[PDB]
């Protein structure tokens, strides 16, 4: 239950590879995963503003407007091991209300928006609460070139220091009031372990 | 959209065994999948004696109607198949909200064995409504009787003990009692490169 506002809860979250060696098999890679004492460390939001886009709209404009407790960081160390592919994103909300939510996902390289996905999602009653479901979205081919650029490179330091100018914004909406629901910046190194994280939350002081 | 009555219509359908061979690598195997339309008529009476048939049995079921819902489904199943799990989904649509019940019934000499039951919401998706059965997990009946045909050192003696196996699903609106559909399963084993196989036929008389 980290990721989660008063409102609204990212259960699971996966970024994944999958191939069809034939009509009855497959084989699934997963690059990064969520959800597969619950107290979160929090780190000071303006050590990050610069690696996000902000003008009207960018992630200081949207942590301002709050609720500040929707905001979070997501440390991902990914796993590129992996030698008809499908190259996805799943995940999945919960929330008590019945809502239709809007998730937009932002890419940005050198703090600066690349792509943006914006899909709007209706809730399904489940087990005593709503839920949000996004399966298997397909990642947007700038993306899938950056895997097979990172991938070219012959040391892990060198994905490393790639990445540090990589990240994704991720915002979640009431598309009924235009709330935050949720609002998840995402950071990223490849893993010498395999896919790791840790969550924090975002605060202001 | 051959598996379709006038209120639901079956997209997909698909009983898997997936295994995790470390926390970021799945195999998927598929035993069974489904997803001018005609498609050809077969007299239910043929059937009646390999499925359950006391109140509430399959003729009942035919009887009451409507018997547009009623169709019966050969597969010819993939057992090439070297941390596991062994599911089932779905997916259904229809033009209606309704709250449904699927009920499946699997049979061993017309006679039943296991009976799962499940209750599914609708989504709203697109103008219509949609309802998933992800991830259902199989009986340890059926588990178990998927390792005792492995066993049987040929395809023909699988086929034979397959003769006695049938399973029979019926959706039904949970609030009306109303059949949506209703799916009399029968098998054989593939022996086909391209694996899994169906044909998918109207139940009617
Ligand atoms: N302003 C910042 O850089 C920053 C400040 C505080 C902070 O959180 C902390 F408070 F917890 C951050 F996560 C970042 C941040 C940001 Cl915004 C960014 F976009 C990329 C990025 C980092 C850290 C890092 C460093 N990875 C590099 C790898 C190259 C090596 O040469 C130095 C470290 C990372 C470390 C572990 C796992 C994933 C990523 O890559
Ligand atoms: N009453 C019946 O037997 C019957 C009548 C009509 C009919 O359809 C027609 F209307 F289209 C049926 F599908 C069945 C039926 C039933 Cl109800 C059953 F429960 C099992 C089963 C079959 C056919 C079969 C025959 N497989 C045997 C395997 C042993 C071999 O020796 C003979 C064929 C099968 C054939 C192909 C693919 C899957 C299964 O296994
Ligand atoms: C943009 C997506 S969202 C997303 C996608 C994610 O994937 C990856 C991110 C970074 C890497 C690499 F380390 F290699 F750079 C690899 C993958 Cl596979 C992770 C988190 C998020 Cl949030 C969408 O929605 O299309
Ligand atoms: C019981 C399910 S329903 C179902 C499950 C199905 O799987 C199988 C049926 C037969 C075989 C074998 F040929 F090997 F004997 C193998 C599988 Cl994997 C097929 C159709 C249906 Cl309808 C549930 O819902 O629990």
Request: charge should be negative; proline fraction near 3%.
């Amino acid at each position: 239950r980290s990721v989660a506002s008063s409102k609204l809860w990212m259960l699971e979250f996966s970024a994944f590879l999958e191939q069809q060696q034939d009509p009855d098999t497959y084989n699934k890679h997963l690059f990064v995963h969520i959800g597969q004492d619950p107290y979160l460390e929090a780190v000071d939001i303006r050590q990050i503003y610069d690696k996000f886009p902000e003008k009207k709209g960018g992630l200081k404009d949207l942590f301002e407007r709050g609720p500040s407790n929707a905001f979070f960081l997501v440390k991902f160390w990914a796993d590129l091991n992996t030698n008809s592919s499908f190259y996805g994103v799943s995940s999945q909300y919960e929330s008590p209300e019945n809502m239709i939510i809007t998730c937009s996902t932002k890419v940005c390289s050198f703090g600066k928006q690349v792509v943006e996905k914006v899909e709007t999602e209706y809730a399904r009653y489940e087990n005593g609460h709503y839920s949000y479901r996004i399966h298997r979205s397909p990642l947007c081919e700038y993306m899938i070139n950056f895997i097979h650029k990172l991938k070219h490179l012959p040391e892990k330091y060198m994905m490393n220091s790639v990445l540090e100018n990589f990240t994704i914004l991720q915002v979640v909406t009431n598309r009924d009031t235009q709330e935050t629901l949720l609002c998840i910046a995402y950071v990223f190194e490849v893993s010498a372990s395999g896919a790791q994280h840790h969550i924090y939350r975002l605060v202001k002081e």
